[PDB]
Amino acid sequence: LEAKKEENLADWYSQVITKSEMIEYHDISGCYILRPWAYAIWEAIKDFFDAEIKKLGVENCYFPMFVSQSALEKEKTHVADFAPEVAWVTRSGKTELAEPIAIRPTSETVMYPAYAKWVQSHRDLPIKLNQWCNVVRWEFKHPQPFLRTREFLWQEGHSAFATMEEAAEEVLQILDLYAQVYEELLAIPVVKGRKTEKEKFAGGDYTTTIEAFISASGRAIQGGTSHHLGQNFSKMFEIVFEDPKIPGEKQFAYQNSWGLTTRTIGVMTMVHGDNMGLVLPPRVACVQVVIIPCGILSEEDKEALIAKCNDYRRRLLSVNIRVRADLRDNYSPGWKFNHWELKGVPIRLEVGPRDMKSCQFVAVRRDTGEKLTVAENEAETKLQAILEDIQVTLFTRASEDLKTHMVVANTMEDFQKILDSGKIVQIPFCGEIDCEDWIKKTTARDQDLEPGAPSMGAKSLCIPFKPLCELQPGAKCVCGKNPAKYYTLFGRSY
Amino acid sequence: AKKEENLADWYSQVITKSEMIEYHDISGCYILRPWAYAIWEAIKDFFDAEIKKLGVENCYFPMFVSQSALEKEKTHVADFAPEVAWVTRSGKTELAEPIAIRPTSETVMYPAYAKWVQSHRDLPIKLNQWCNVVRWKHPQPFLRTREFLWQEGHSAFATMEEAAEEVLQILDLYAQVYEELLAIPVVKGRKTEKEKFAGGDYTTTIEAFISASGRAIQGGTSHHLGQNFSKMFEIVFEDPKIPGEKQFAYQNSWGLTTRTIGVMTMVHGDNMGLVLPPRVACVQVVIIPCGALIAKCNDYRRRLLSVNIRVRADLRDNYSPGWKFNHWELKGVPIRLEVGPRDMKSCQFVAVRRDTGEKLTVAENEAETKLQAILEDIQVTLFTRASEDLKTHMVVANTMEDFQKILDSGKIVQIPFCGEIDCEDWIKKTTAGAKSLCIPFKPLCEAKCVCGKNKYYTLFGRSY
Ligand SMILES: Nc1ncnc2cc(-c3cccc(S(=O)(=O)NC(=O)[C@@H]4CCCN4)c3)ccc12
Numbered sequence: 001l002e003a004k005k006e007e008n009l010a011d012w013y014s015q016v017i018t019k020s021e022m023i024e025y026h027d028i029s030g031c032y033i034l035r036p037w038a039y040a041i042w043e044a045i046k047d048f049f050d051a052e053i054k055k056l057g058v059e060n061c062y063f064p065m066f067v068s069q070s071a072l073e074k075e076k077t078h079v080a081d082f083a084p085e086v087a088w089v090t091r092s093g094k095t096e097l098a099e100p101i102a103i104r105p106t107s108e109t110v111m112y113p114a115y116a117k118w119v120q121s122h123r124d125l126p127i128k129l130n131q132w133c134n135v136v137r138w139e140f141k142h143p144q145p146f147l148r149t150r151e152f153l154w155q156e157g158h159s160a161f162a163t164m165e166e167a168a169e170e171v172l173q174i175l176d177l178y179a180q181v182y183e184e185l186l187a188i189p190v191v192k193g194r195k196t197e198k199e200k201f202a203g204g205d206y207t208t209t210i211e212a213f214i215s216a217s218g219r220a221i222q223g224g225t226s227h228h229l230g231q232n233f234s235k236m237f238e239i240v241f242e243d244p245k246i247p248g249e250k251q252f253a254y255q256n257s258w259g260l261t262t263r264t265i266g267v268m269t270m271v272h273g274d275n276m277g278l279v280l281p282p283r284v285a286c287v288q289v290v291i292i293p294c295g296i297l298s299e300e301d302k303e304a305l306i307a308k309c310n311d312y313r314r315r316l317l318s319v320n321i322r323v324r325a326d327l328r329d330n331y332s333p334g335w336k337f338n339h340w341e342l343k344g345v346p347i348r349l350e351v352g353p354r355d356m357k358s359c360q361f362v363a364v365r366r367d368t369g370e371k372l373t374v375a376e377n378e379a380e381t382k383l384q385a386i387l388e389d390i391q392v393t394l395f396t397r398a399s400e401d402l403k404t405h406m407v408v409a410n411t412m413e414d415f416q417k418i419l420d421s422g423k424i425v426q427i428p429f430c431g432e433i434d435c436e437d438w439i440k441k442t443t444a445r446d447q448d449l450e451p452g453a454p455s456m457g458a459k460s461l462c463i464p465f466k467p468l469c470e471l472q473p474g475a476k477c478v479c480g481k482n483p484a485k486y487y488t489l490f491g492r493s494y
Numbered sequence: 495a496k497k498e499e500n501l502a503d504w505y506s507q508v509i510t511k512s513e514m515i516e517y518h519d520i521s522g523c524y525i526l527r528p529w530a531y532a533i534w535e536a537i538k539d540f541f542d543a544e545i546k547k548l549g550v551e552n553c554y555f556p557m558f559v560s561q562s563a564l565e566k567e568k569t570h571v572a573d574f575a576p577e578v579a580w581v582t583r584s585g586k587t588e589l590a591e592p593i594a595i596r597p598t599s600e601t602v603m604y605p606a607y608a609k610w611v612q613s614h615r616d617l618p619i620k621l622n623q624w625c626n627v628v629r630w631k632h633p634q635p636f637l638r639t640r641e642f643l644w645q646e647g648h649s650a651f652a653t654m655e656e657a658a659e660e661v662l663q664i665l666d667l668y669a670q671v672y673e674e675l676l677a678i679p680v681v682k683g684r685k686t687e688k689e690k691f692a693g694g695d696y697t698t699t700i701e702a703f704i705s706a707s708g709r710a711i712q713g714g715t716s717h718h719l720g721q722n723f724s725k726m727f728e729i730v731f732e733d734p735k736i737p738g739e740k741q742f743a744y745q746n747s748w749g750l751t752t753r754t755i756g757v758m759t760m761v762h763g764d765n766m767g768l769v770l771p772p773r774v775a776c777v778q779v780v781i782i783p784c785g786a787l788i789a790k791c792n793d794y795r796r797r798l799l800s801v802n803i804r805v806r807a808d809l810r811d812n813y814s815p816g817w818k819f820n821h822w823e824l825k826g827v828p829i830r831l832e833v834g835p836r837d838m839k840s841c842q843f844v845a846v847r848r849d850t851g852e853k854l855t856v857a858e859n860e861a862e863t864k865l866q867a868i869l870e871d872i873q874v875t876l877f878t879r880a881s882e883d884l885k886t887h888m889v890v891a892n893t894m895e896d897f898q899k900i901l902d903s904g905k906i907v908q909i910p911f912c913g914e915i916d917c918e919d920w921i922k923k924t925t926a927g928a929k930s931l932c933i934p935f936k937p938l939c940e941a942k943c944v945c946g947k948n949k950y951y952t953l954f955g956r957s958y
């Protein structure tokens with residue numbers, strides 16, 4: 001890497017994603033190629049989330065990518081929010097279409113006409129569906145690989161229930177899974193919370209979210225969201241049923257929306273990435289251990305050394321360790337070391353002639369760089385132990401970094417100074433869209449930051465379920481105009 | 495509805511009542527419900543495992559292609575141009591230049607391939623992606639849709655020999671998907687110049703036969719693109735021997751789509767609904783209480799799960815057993831396992847094969863052995879029934895008279911063929927229309943073309 005994370009974050013990130021062979025650029029702005037190395041991380045997330053949502057009775061399906069103008073516009077505030085971000089198809093080949101069709105930014109308006117048909121009685125509920133698909137949003141934002149892309153891969157779950165209580169329970173169940181995806185797969189701590197009125201999903205009653213923190217830039221980012229849509233969509237799409245207990249009266253179904261994207265991968269890079277490259281949490285690493293021959297003798301001797309490497313490979317494969325042996329003749333060991341370091345492989349396994357004769361090998365951790373000499377027979381258990389430990393250290397390091405960078409302020413003045421220290425702050429909040437808009441403008445106007453940093457106002461992240469402090473009985477919004485409703489997390493963001 | 499009568503009405507009834515398909519307000523777009531999507535997942539699980547053994551890696555490229563990139567190979571762009579959907583505005587803001595939704599990702603991927611190949615050390619590159627594509631004939635669920643799910647594999651090699659091997663390896667994997675998984679026989683073959691992939695040297699294909707409509711359909715294709723794209727996209731490496739000599743990479747691309755599920759429906763489906771090949775069925779056995787009773791059902795559930803039989807126990811109280819019979823029947827579950835009091839008392843149960851409707855009383859102790867044995871038999875039966883069907887409906891013919899007669903009886907036929915595009919072009923006109931399906935690798939028989947003017951036996955038929 002030429003660039004350093006502390007010196008220039010953008011250049012560092014740009015170098016990490018390309019040199020790790022995760023991302024390649026496209027000639028369409030905001031669109032990035034997910035090379036195998038990146039894609040494998042997404043596949044690992046998929047394997048885990050899928051198993052978990054199957055336990056909850058959720059089933060996979062595939063809905064069409066195209067939505068009609070009529071369907072898109074059925075729920076009025078939802079379409080109002082998304083109409084500018086929607087890409088329109090207006091012609092096939094040379095023929096203009098009679099009616100333009102929209103690429104889904106989100107599949108509520110695609111799926112709910114089908115839900116209307118399928119729900120004929122109360123027995124038809126609940127309906128729990130999920131799809132893994134691509135979606136396109138032309139947002140007015142600066143695009144960054146993974147974090148903010150014009151096209152993105154995601155999953156979207158859409159559920160429908162007879163009662164609000166049943167729907168409410170699912171929301172938090174999904175939000176916990178997302179937390180698990182971040183915390184125990186990616187070793188990233190998150191803050192569960194409820195979005196404010198201004199930042200909540202258009203068309204839902206309420207939105208839950210997980211917020212992650214990137215130490216380097218001092219900014220927070222949304223990891224995933226789970227919404228309760230109430231009956232806003234069911235009244236518009238006529239997803240209705242007759243309650244046995246309430247004769248002759250049509251009930252509207254209660255609905256939830258939940259989504260998680262390839263943004264995760266960017267967050268993982270920003271949080272754990274270092275100046276030697278990418279750092280993969282062992283849980284999501286395509287390759288957990290890479291075996292490299294050293295000290296390359298006769299043709300027979302070279303073959304035997306290769307055979308030793310491949311035996312290690314077999315041993316690790318048998319204990320469910322994901323392992324590759326880099327046996328290429330064309331690259332020197334040193335080249336290989338750097339290459340795999342750049343890609344963030346958790347463990348490098350070094351094997352030379354002297355080590356083979358001595359019945360030992362060298363393990364090098366990616367997180368710390370600790371070199372360690374292990375006995376040949378203790379390979380499975382020791383490396384398994386090291387991998388388990390790398391995961392904990394990454395999560396531990398990040399948890400400590402989150403803990404100290406999230407603090408409490410009770411004045412606008414206090415809020416400003418801490419924010420400009422590269423921190424996120426829980427403040428007492430009115431909850432009004434006016435309070436929030438004013439804060440955005442003010443935190444930017446009064447901001448004091450380093451010579452390069454551009455003007456960036458703070459926005460709400462979430463109203464935490466578990467705030468650091470309880471709200472003082474008579475406390476007021478930092479604006480001073482009205483009383484505080486809840487402690488709310490605020491910060492610079494994406 | 496009935497298959498032998500109104501086939502279009504029958505097909506619509508089967509895909510909806512099996513809960514595979516729902517209709518959409520955009521023409522030629524159909525919702526894959528879980529039941530349909532599970533088959534695709536089963537297909538994907540198999541095929542994905544197989545291509546990994548060959549060193550293929552998964553990835554994801556963008557859905558959008560620039561006008562410039564799409565036009566780089568003139569043959570390829572000319573053929574695809576009329577069926578490309580164009581995005582021209584986001585919200586109410588007209589784009590400076592239109593961008594196209596991919597009908598296929600050759601023109602999206604190969605610019606990247608050019609950058610990643612600096613030496614012959616960088617080859618081979620073998621990438622697959624599971625994604626959707628859009629191609630704008632009247633739409634049919636599964637068989638001919640405006641949007642469809644597929645995999646597309648794109649490979650690049652230093653040598654032609656290496657590429658040629660993979661083409662046929664992939665083709666055999668497609669054949670396995672159809673034959674081993676879906677119990678559908680297919681004909682491996684080569685496309686003619688007329689019907690080959692635009693921008694490729696040669697196209698291999700598997701052909702499946704839908705008896706009901708007397709129509710053939712391409713199951714999957716594998717192309718050797720040779721140097722046609724690499725020349726246009728400058729995917730080059732330095733000659734290892736000759737200084738200052740550029741070499742062009744040899745390339746292949748291969749694809750399989752959700753059309754498989756349509757072919758499965760049309761071939762094995764009957765008048766009682768959908769029939770699922772057990773190998774690809776997410777629910778192999780369904781247990782239904784008839785007439786305590788539930789505990790015995792669960793023992794069966796547990797016993798079957800232990801031997802890797804995919805089983806569901808429908809112990810719902812709010813639907814009758816009669817409803818459940820029809821529901822899972824329409825869904826084509828291979829085996830139903832009825833368990834009522836009398837049979838429960840007598841330590842037995844009745845197993846009903848989906849395909850033949852056969853009823854068998856089975857001792858409790860022999861469930862794992864017997865049901866597994868039944869599943870394999872249904873799979874073989876299905877393949878055997880369709881094999882025979884194909885043999886009857888595909889024949890040899892040497893004259894337009896004999897040929898035309900066979901085509902009129904809803905069959906496909908292998909004919910000696912000139913190979914000329916115009917002869918083929920003529921053939922369609924005369925027969926209306928019958929098109930070339932493939933030149934079989936293993937033709938039935940070993941002369942002059944039907945046009946009488948001027949190569950190989952070529953399978954011909956009415957096509958989707
Ligand atoms: N441009 C972008 N690049 C990368 N990742 C992104 C993620 C979201 C995102 C992620 C999850 C949920 C949402 S949402 O809009 O708050 N909710 C929804 O869309 C719901 C969730 C299921 C479908 N409707 C946005 C929005 C833009 C992104």
Ligand SMILES: Nc1ncnc2cc(-c3cccc(S(=O)(=O)NC(=O)[C@@H]4CCCN4)c3)ccc12
Pocket residue numbers: 597598599600629636637638639640642645646647691714715747748749750751752753
């Ligand atoms: N309308 C449709 N509905 C459902 N399935 C379909 C499948 C193909 C299809 C399947 C495989 C390959 C091809 S192709 O055009 O011969 N080849 C390609 O597109 C290559 C191979 C994969 C990458 N490009 C078409 C074409 C239309 C379809």
